[PDB]
């Protein structure tokens, strides 16, 4: 009897340390306002000693569970979209479920870089509709511990955060996920990467510190590919939901870079004014950006029935996706 899913609850969490552009600009020897003019970021949050990825996910998730007024037994599945799990084994999701007291919930990690959340949303929707039970979806990242401070292009963008949504089963049609498009382009696999620690170059004694840290090979190629991926996926989910950009109530792009948000907005003819923008205070926390923005915009103005959200993201991989969601 389940025909759709609903975003029944929202949440987000950051570590407490607020890092202004001025601190980073000092470390990298750039004049004042460099970061804000080129990225739209004004400050970001970075994790501190003691802060764990699963604990950050836990705070966002608890906020979303309480927002939904859902009992913790009712969560059948927890999807944790992250690139930065506590350990390389086991995944962080079973610990997140445990910390939240979700005793009947399965749990698994999804690694889809900055696109991870949209994949998890899509797969969760298919679970809710197939099984008629609720799913908790958390995206969270502590990228700060992966930042190469000497690499200006990445050290100025990436941030730590978590966002969470509780999806519940709904009997009605023509609502929920109207369309979804998940893409990949592995020719760009090498554009955003960590060299060491996977199976191709396991972490070894005496490795170059920087080999454990993120690198962005071609910031301009990455910009072009990501804009194309977000535009093209957005475009086809709009057509499949039979909506136009003028019909979207809120546009929630991945918060990669304000200039990319602008590029996609322009390409689709979507007002900036309908576009949720959280990069100014929260930076680029990869897969976490879209659910943190959803929590923020819902906090500002509760999502009203009939509103349409366009969610889109692109990330390392390359990966990309878009979702048309009707409240």
Ligand X SMILES: CC(C)(COP(=O)(O)OP(=O)(O)OC[C@H]1O[C@@H](n2cnc3c(N)ncnc32)[C@H](O)[C@@H]1OP(=O)(O)O)[C@@H](O)C(=O)NCCC(=O)NCCSC(=O)CCCC(=O)O
Shortest Cβ distance from residue 260 to ligand X (Å)?
Answer: 5
Q: Which of 9, 61, 253, 321 binds a copy of itself (CB under 8 A)?
A: 321
Calpha distance 326→304 (Å, rounded): 10
Calpha distance 296→107 (Å, rounded): 25
Q: What are phi and psi of 180, to 5 degrees?
A: -155, 145
N- to C-terminal Cα separation, the chain: 19
Calpha distance 147→36 (Å, rounded): 18
Query: How many other CB atoms sit within 10 Å of the CB of residue 196?
Result: 16
Site for a copy of itself in 126-185 (CB under 8 A): 126-127, 129-131, 142, 145-146, 180-185
Site for ligand X in 255-294 (CB under 6 A): 256-257, 259-260, 284, 286-287
The residue range among 23-31, 47-55, 241-249, 306-314 that interacts with a copy of itself, by the rule CB under 8 A, is: 47-55
Nearer to ligand X, 86 or 218 (CB): 218
Calpha distance 179→187 (Å, rounded): 26
Q: Which of 157, 164, 237, 309 binds ligand X (CB under 6 A)?
A: 157
Please check whether residue 111 is in contact with residue 70, taking contact to mean a CB–CB distance below 8 angstroms.
Answer: no
Query: Pairing state of beta strands 250-253 and 308-315?
Result: parallel
Site for ligand X in 88-117 (CB under 6 A): 89, 113-114
Nearer to ligand X, 5 or 84 (CB): 84
Nearer to a copy of itself, 110 or 155 (CB): 110
- Residue whose C-alpha is closest to residue 84's, from 109, 49, 48: 109
The residue range among 3-11, 70-78, 150-158, 291-299 that interacts with ligand X, by the rule CB under 6 A, is: 150-158
User: Is residue 315 within the footprint of ligand X (CB under 6 A)?
Assistant: yes
119 binds, among a copy of itself, ligand X, none (CB under 5 to 8 A by kind): a copy of itself
Q: Sign of dihedral through CA atoms 193, 16, 13, 32?
A: negative
Calpha distance 71→80 (Å, rounded): 19
Q: Interface with ligand X by CB under 6 A: which residues?
A: 38-39, 83, 89, 113-114, 141, 143, 152-153, 156-157, 192, 216, 218-220, 222-223, 226, 256-257, 259-260, 284, 286-287, 315-316
């Amino acid at each position: 009897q389940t025909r759709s899913s609903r975003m029944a609850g929202f949440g987000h969490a950051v570590p407490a340390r607020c890092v202004d552009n001025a601190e980073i600009e000092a470390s990298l020897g750039l004049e004042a306002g460099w970061i804000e003019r080129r990225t739209g970021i004004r400050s970001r949050y970075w994790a501190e000693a003691g802060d764990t990825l699963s604990g950050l996910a836990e705070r966002a998730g608890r906020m979303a569970l309480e927002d939904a007024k859902i009992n913790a037994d009712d969560i059948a599945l927890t999807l944790l979209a992250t690139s930065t799990p506590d350990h390389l084994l086991p995944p962080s999701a079973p610990l997140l479920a445990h910390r939240l007291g979700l005793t009947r919930s399965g749990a698994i990690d999804l690694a889809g870089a900055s696109s991870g959340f949209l994949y998890a949303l899509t797969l969760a929707d298919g679970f809710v509709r197939t099984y008629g039970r609720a799913v908790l979806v958390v995206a969270a990242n502590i990228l700060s511990r992966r930042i190469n401070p000497a690499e200006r292009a990445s050290a100025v963008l990436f941030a730590d955060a978590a966002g969470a949504v509780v999806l519940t089963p709904c009997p009605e049609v023509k609502r929920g996920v109207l369309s979804a498009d998940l893409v990949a382009d592995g020719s760009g696999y090498d554009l955003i990467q960590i060299a060491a620690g996977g199976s191709s170059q396991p972490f070894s004694a005496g490795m170059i510190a920087e080999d454990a840290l993120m690198t962005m090979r071609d910031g301009r190629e990455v910009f072009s590919r990501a804009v194309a991926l977000m535009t093209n996926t957005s475009q086809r989910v709009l057509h499949e939901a039979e909506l136009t950009a003028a019909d979207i109530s809120r546009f929630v792009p991945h918060q990669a870079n304000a200039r990319m948000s602008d590029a996609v907005c322009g390409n689709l003819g979507i007002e900036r004014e309908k576009t949720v923008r959280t990069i100014g205070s929260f930076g680029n926390s990869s897969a976490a950006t879209i659910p943190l923005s959803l929590s923020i915009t819902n906090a500002e103005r509760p999502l009203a029935g009939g509103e349409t959200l366009l969610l889109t993201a692109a990330g390392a991989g390359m990966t990309g996706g878009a979702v048309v969601y009707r409240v």
